[PDB]
Design a protein around this ligand. Sequence first.
Ligand SMILES: *C(=N)CNC(=O)[C@H](CS(=O)(=O)N1CCN(c2ccccn2)CC1)NC(=O)Cc1cc(C)no1
Ligand SMILES: *C(=N)CNC(=O)[C@H](CS(=O)(=O)N1CCN(c2ccccn2)CC1)NC(=O)Cc1cc(C)no1
Lengths: 220, 220
Amino acid sequence: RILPDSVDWREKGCVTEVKYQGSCGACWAFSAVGALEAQLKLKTGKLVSLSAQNLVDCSTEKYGNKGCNGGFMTTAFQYIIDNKGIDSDASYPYKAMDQKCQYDSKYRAATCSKYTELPYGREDVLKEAVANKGPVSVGVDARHPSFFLYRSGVYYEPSCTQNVNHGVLVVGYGDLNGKEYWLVKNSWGHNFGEEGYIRMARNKGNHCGIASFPSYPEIH
Amino acid sequence: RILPDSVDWREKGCVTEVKYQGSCGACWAFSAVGALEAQLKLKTGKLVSLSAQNLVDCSTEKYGNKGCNGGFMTTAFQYIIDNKGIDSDASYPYKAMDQKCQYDSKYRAATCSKYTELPYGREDVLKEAVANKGPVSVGVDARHPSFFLYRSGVYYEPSCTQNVNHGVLVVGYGDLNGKEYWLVKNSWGHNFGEEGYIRMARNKGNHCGIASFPSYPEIH
Ligand SMILES: *C(=N)CNC(=O)[C@H](CS(=O)(=O)N1CCN(c2ccccn2)CC1)NC(=O)Cc1cc(C)no1
Ligand SMILES: *C(=N)CNC(=O)[C@H](CS(=O)(=O)N1CCN(c2ccccn2)CC1)NC(=O)Cc1cc(C)no1
C-alpha cells in the first residue's frame, strides 16, 4: 500500500498510559511491554498494561538482561515466547527494583509467538512497520542534556549520535510545522516531554539512532 | 529436510585462511567478512578474503561501531548493503588500527543484499542455518581464561554466561564421540586453539551465548 503520511496508534486505542520507571534502568522492559500491548489490543480488542516488572525479574541472565541495569527488547520478547506468557501489570506491579521471578500463569495477560528485528538504520522500513504492524520498540541516544529538557516541537540535537542507550517505543510518525518526526513514548513519567512523549526528528540521517535497532512482537 | 548430523563448510571450499586481528578489537569485522566470504563462494565459485579493514575504517559511528574498540556484525552487513560493496582484502589489507575510510569501488569484491538475525538463544535454529544457509556470525562469552588457554577438544566453561563479547564465525557442527559441538573460526591467528578454530559445546543450554545473537548475510 501507499503508506499514510501520519500515524498515531493512540487514536486506535493501542497505547497504554505512560509509565514511570524511577531510578531503575528498566526502559527495555517498558519498551517491550508497550510494543506487545498494542498487539494484544489488535488481537483481542482489549487494552491491558503488561508487567514490565515480570521482565525485570524473570528475563534475566539467560536473556542477556540485567534488570535495573539494562537489557534488550528482543531478548525480552524471546523470554515471553519461551515462558508461554507475561502477566498483567495489575497482577505483577512495578517496584523499580530487581526481585525474584514471581511469574504465575494464572495472571497471564498476553503471549508472544515471534519477534522481528528491522534492518539497521532504515527509516523507510521503520515507517512501513509503524504503519502496517504497530508500535515498534527502538533504542535512542538519550545522553545529551537537551533530551532531558525537551518540552515541545520536534527534537533535533546536532550532538546526537547513533550510540543508543535508552529503550523507547515509536507509536507514530508525522510532520509538525514542516518537520518530520517519530512519535516516541518514554517511560520517565508524564513530567517528561509532552505528557511523557517526545517527537524526534525523522528522515534526518537516523537521528539519535532511532532506526538503528527497531523490533516488534506478534501474537499467534 | 532432516539435517545432517555434522557439517564442515571448510570441506565445501567456503572458508578462507584464519586471520590474526592482533591488538585491534576487530573480531566483529572478521566475523562479518567470513560469513560473506562463504556466500560469495556459493554465488560466484571464487573463495576470496574480504577486507576486514574496510569495515573497521568505514562501518564506523553511523553503524554504532568503534573500529578497534568493537562493533556489530549486523551493522557491518548493513554498511556493505548501503555502500553497494566491500573491497578485497588484497586491495585493502588489514592494519590492526583505526584508519580513515579508503573504500574504492574499483576494488569491490562482494556485495550484500540483506542479512538475517536468528531468534535469540535457539540452537536448533542455528543448526538449521549452518546446515542450509552457510557459516553464521555469532557472539560468544570469551571473558574466561579457559577461552584464551583452549588448545583442543570440545570447550565447556562452567562459568560461561550469555553476556557475549567476542564475535566469531560458526563454520560447522558435529560431535567428538558424542560430545556435540559448534565448529568456530576465530580471528586470533593460526596459533590459537585447533589451528585457529575452537569447538564449543553445543546443545548445552546456549553455552557461552553462542546462539544468543546469530546472523548471516546473503547476496543477490
Ligand atoms: C534504560 N533505562 C536503559 N537502557 C537499556 O537498558 C538499553 C536499551 S536500548 O534500547 O538502548 N538497547 C537495546 C537494543 N540494543 C542493541 C544494540 C546492538 C544490537 C542490537 N540491539 C542497543 C541497546 N540497553 C542496553 O544499553 C544494553 C545493551 C547495550 C548494547 C550496546 N547492547 O545491549
Ligand atoms: C572483538 N575483538 C571485540 N568484541 C566486539 O566487537 C563485540 C562482538 S560480539 O560478538 O560480542 N557482539 C556483536 C553481536 N552483538 C549483537 C547483539 C544483539 C544483536 C546483534 N548483535 C552483541 C555484541 N561487540 C561488542 O562488544 C559491541 C556490543 C554491542 C552490544 C549490544 N554489546 O556489545
